[PDB]
Amino acid sequence: LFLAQEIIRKKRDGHALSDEEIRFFINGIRDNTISEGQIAALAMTIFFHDMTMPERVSLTMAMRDSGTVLDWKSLHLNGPIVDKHSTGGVGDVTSLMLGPMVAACGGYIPMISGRGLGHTGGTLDKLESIPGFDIFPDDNRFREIIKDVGVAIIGQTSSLAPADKRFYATRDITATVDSIPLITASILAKKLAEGLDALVMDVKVGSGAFMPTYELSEALAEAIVGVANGAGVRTTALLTDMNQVLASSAGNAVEVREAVQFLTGEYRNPRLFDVTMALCVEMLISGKLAKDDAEARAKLQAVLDNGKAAEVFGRMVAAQKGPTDFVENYAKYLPTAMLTKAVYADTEGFVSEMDTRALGMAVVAMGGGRRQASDTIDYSVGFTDMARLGDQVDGQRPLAVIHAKDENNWQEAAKAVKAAIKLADKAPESTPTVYRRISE
Amino acid sequence: LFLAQEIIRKKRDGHALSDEEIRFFINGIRDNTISEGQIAALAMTIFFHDMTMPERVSLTMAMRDSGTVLDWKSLHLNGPIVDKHSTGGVGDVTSLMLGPMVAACGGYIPMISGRGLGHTGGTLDKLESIPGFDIFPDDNRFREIIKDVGVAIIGQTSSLAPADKRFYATRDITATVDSIPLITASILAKKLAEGLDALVMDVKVGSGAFMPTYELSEALAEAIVGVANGAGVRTTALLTDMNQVLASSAGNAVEVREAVQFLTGEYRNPRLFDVTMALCVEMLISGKLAKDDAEARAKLQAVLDNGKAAEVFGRMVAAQKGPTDFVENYAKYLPTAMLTKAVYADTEGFVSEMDTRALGMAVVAMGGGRRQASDTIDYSVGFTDMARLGDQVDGQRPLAVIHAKDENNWQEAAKAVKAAIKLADKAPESTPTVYRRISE
Numbered sequence: 057l058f059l060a061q062e063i064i065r066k067k068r069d070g071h072a073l074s075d076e077e078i079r080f081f082i083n084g085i086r087d088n089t090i091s092e093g094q095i096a097a098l099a100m101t102i103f104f105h106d107m108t109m110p111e112r113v114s115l116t117m118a119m120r121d122s123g124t125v126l127d128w129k130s131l132h133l134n135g136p137i138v139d140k141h142s143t144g145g146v147g148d149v150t151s152l153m154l155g156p157m158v159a160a161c162g163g164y165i166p167m168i169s170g171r172g173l174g175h176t177g178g179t180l181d182k183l184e185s186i187p188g189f190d191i192f193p194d195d196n197r198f199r200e201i202i203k204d205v206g207v208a209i210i211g212q213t214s215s216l217a218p219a220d221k222r223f224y225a226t227r228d229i230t231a232t233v234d235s236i237p238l239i240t241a242s243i244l245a246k247k248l249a250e251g252l253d254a255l256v257m258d259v260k261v262g263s264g265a266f267m268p269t270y271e272l273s274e275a276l277a278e279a280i281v282g283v284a285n286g287a288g289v290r291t292t293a294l295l296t297d298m299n300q301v302l303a304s305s306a307g308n309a310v311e312v313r314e315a316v317q318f319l320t321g322e323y324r325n326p327r328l329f330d331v332t333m334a335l336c337v338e339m340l341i342s343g344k345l346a347k348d349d350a351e352a353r354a355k356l357q358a359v360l361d362n363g364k365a366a367e368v369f370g371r372m373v374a375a376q377k378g379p380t381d382f383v384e385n386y387a388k389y390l391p392t393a394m395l396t397k398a399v400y401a402d403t404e405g406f407v408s409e410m411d412t413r414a415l416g417m418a419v420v421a422m423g424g425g426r427r428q429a430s431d432t433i434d435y436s437v438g439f440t441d442m443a444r445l446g447d448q449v450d451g452q453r454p455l456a457v458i459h460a461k462d463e464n465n466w467q468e469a470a471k472a473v474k475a476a477i478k479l480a481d482k483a484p485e486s487t488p489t490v491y492r493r494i495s496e
Numbered sequence: 497l498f499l500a501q502e503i504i505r506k507k508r509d510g511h512a513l514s515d516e517e518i519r520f521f522i523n524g525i526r527d528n529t530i531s532e533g534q535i536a537a538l539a540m541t542i543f544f545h546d547m548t549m550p551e552r553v554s555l556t557m558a559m560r561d562s563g564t565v566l567d568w569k570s571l572h573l574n575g576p577i578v579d580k581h582s583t584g585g586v587g588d589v590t591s592l593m594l595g596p597m598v599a600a601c602g603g604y605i606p607m608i609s610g611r612g613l614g615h616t617g618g619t620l621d622k623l624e625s626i627p628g629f630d631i632f633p634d635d636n637r638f639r640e641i642i643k644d645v646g647v648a649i650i651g652q653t654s655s656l657a658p659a660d661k662r663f664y665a666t667r668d669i670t671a672t673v674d675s676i677p678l679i680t681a682s683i684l685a686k687k688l689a690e691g692l693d694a695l696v697m698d699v700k701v702g703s704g705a706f707m708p709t710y711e712l713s714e715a716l717a718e719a720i721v722g723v724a725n726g727a728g729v730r731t732t733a734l735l736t737d738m739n740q741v742l743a744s745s746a747g748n749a750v751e752v753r754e755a756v757q758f759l760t761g762e763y764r765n766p767r768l769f770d771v772t773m774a775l776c777v778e779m780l781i782s783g784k785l786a787k788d789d790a791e792a793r794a795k796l797q798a799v800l801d802n803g804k805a806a807e808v809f810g811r812m813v814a815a816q817k818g819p820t821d822f823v824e825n826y827a828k829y830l831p832t833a834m835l836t837k838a839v840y841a842d843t844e845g846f847v848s849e850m851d852t853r854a855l856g857m858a859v860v861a862m863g864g865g866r867r868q869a870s871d872t873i874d875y876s877v878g879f880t881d882m883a884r885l886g887d888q889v890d891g892q893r894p895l896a897v898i899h900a901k902d903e904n905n906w907q908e909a910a911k912a913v914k915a916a917i918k919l920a921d922k923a924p925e926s927t928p929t930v931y932r933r934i935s936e
Contacts, residue, residue, distance in 0.1 A: 091669065093532035
């Protein structure tokens with residue numbers, strides 16, 4: 057069709073839009089012929105009426121095509137082009153290990169990640185703690201790294217799924233962000249644009265999650281699986297727990313250290329290990345690198361044990377302009393916080409629950425996140441040695457270790473940490489790290 | 497409240513907005529702090545959820561106050577400040593007679609009219625056919641005319657209900673125009689802003705009407721009556737027929753002549769007389785100028801018979817910079833069309849129905865209306881001697897007399913006129929001019 061009003065109206069009256077109309081609208085958004093008021097109205101219409109699977113796929117496909125779509129056939133990489141994505145959380149440093157691990161197993165990961173949104177952290181921000189790390193290599197450089205190293209974690213360019221920038225920006229201030237059809241599209245517009253063969257989704261569940269309840273998480277997970285597979289990308293998704301910090305730390309540089317220590321075998325948080333292994337297993341299978349789940353786990357465990365994964369990580373850091381001896385001297389490069397003191401509970405007991413969102417916001421306020429785009433982040437601030445649910449706390453076991461930039465910064469953060477962690481007398485019932493797997 | 501997103505969201509979730517929130521939003525629209533995307537979303541939310549009477553009144557009141565509101569207490573006009581409004585139609589020249597008539601009966605009419613929208617014509621455009629007529633006098637001048645003459649028909653200024661300009665403009669391209677709550681508000685934001693005591697609404701019904709069916713017309717009529725009275729303005733409304741041209745002509749100058757001839761007693765279309773008398777009766781009563789309906793009709797008939805009404809009309813035209821001898825020499829000033837030829841039906845029979853919208857569009861295309869704001873109108877083109885429903889047509893009785901600016905213009909218009917008027921063998925059932933009266 058060719059009239060925005062008519063298309064907004066058609067959908068407004070509960071009619072399912074045609075591919076030709078969606079394509080038109082999206083192209084118009086990209087072309088700047090469609091106005092902000094018109095993006096807001098359609099979005100509010102898709103909210104009130106949702107969208108059928110065919111139109112959901114049309115939207116994602118349309119957004120994906122509004123810009124550049126990577127093609128890896130030229131490089132002739134005889135190995136799968138796979139990637140992972142997460143709905144975000146706190147302490148979710150999985151991507152820094154998952155990337156190298158999967159790459160060490162014969163996969164190729166053109167990970168176009170992002171920055172911290174609201175209470176959740178952003179991989180790109182964590183990586184930019186590494187002195188000299190470049191998240192924006194030229195396409196020709198990106199290709200070289202993916203060919204030589206097998207993995208690269210870069211930021212999104214203006215050329216990637218352009219329509220989405222205009223779209224999200226609008227729905228962000230028009231109350232049209234919580235809509236499975238649209239959420240699914242933003243997520244997939246970017247990932248599909250990477251010219252993937254397989255993809256695994258990490259849809260968080262819990263107090264640190266994006267979606268309010270387990271049902272909404274499950275739903276979103278399903279929408280994405282159907283649509284991603286509908287567009288021709290082998291996609292599987294896992295519902296993961298985010299009712300407490302996943303890794304043992306929360307921040308930027310603190311989480312990078314934890315990744316290196318994880319990769320080097322010095323320390324591996326058990327939950328983080330589960331989630332990380334799980335997402336990788338899915339990738340090895342979907343990417344056809346391994347057929348049996350047990351075969352996937354075996355290969356991955358191998359790369360962790362022999363150091364191949366750690367080596368690929370260092371090669372990546374170097375390849376993206378970072379230090380040539382990072383996994384060896386990471387301590388010499390990563391900025392340390394001024395003040396590092398532990399915070400203890402006002403009472404003894406077991407950690408029964410923690411408002412992970414609140415913990416997420418506490419790091420932002422410490423300066424480790426952005427309340428606004430123009431904000432500069434302090435790569436040193438953050439939490440370390442996070443107490444886990446079920447942990448008995450006392451004066452010889454802190455709730456967390458706070459890396460603050462000054463006393464006032466510490467005092468405030470400590471207050472927030474103590475208020476977000478609820479203690480009980482009896483140990484809480486253990487909830488699973490990985491709830492379920494989804495596929496079509 | 498103070499957050500647009502939150503307010504859009506509150507309403508989005510079916511919650512009724514508070515006066516404080518509406519006021520905020522509207523003030524924001526006026527202040528330019530609220531974006532187009534945000535006006536579109538709320539509007540689409542008010543569409544899907546409608547609004548309660550209290551919030552409907554809040555919206556109108558808020559829009560009314562976003563700008564200037566006239567006050568007539570300074571002038572100490574010992575007579576009511578009344579006015580009329582119509583949802584528009586074709587051949588709806590009632591305002592040009594209604595104004596002077598009511599004024600001659602002791603009322604005061606600060607009529608802030610408008611221009612032609614879509615298929616309907618606009619009083620201001622008709623009046624601007626009069627050489628030198630000024631629809632934009634300074635407020636001080638407007639007041640003088642209203643004090644001396646009792647009636648003035650001017651165009652809306654930027655200062656009048658400012659929020660509405662931004663609002664309508666947006667909903668016009670976002671598919672959020674057909675919404676009783678919002679429609680009611682635009683209409684009332686302007687009228688209430690005139691500092692009225694009483695108001696009468698002419699809500700059209702039919703093929704030339706704005707609202708699709710009699711139910712929607714009745715509904716809108718009721719919304720307006722409740723809200724207008726809720727804001728403290730004695731308001732009554734009448735459902736009028738627009739299933740055929742109301743007056744005998746359709747255009748700008750052609751309709752001005754018809755008004756003068758009506759006022760002078762040379763010729764009075766029967767339906768137009770009914771509708772015009774009816775609206776005036778309502779105004780005399782609401783304005784307390786007459787208590788009995790029969791007393792209203794008597795007074796009005798009197799001003800028509802003794803020429804007082806015609807005299808007030810001339811005084812108005814002069815007062816607004818028009819000719820001092822218009823009702824006397826209107827022929828000497830009003831532009832005549834180049835080509836004036838009658839169009840006859842391809843067959844004999846009775847006029848059973850006519851697509852008044854189509855007839856409205858035919859005048860626009862002839863150049864007597866605007867398809868776009870930048871368009872200049874030909875004040876000479878139009879239809880005259882319109883055939884009425886039930887009229888037997890033959891070679892000695894044309895469908896209408898077309899005033900075109902050139903042969904090609906005539907040929908095309910004639911085609912449209914013949915295609916919009918449906919003939920039958922048997923005479924159609926006569927429908928009422930005035931369907932019903934509404935009040936609270």
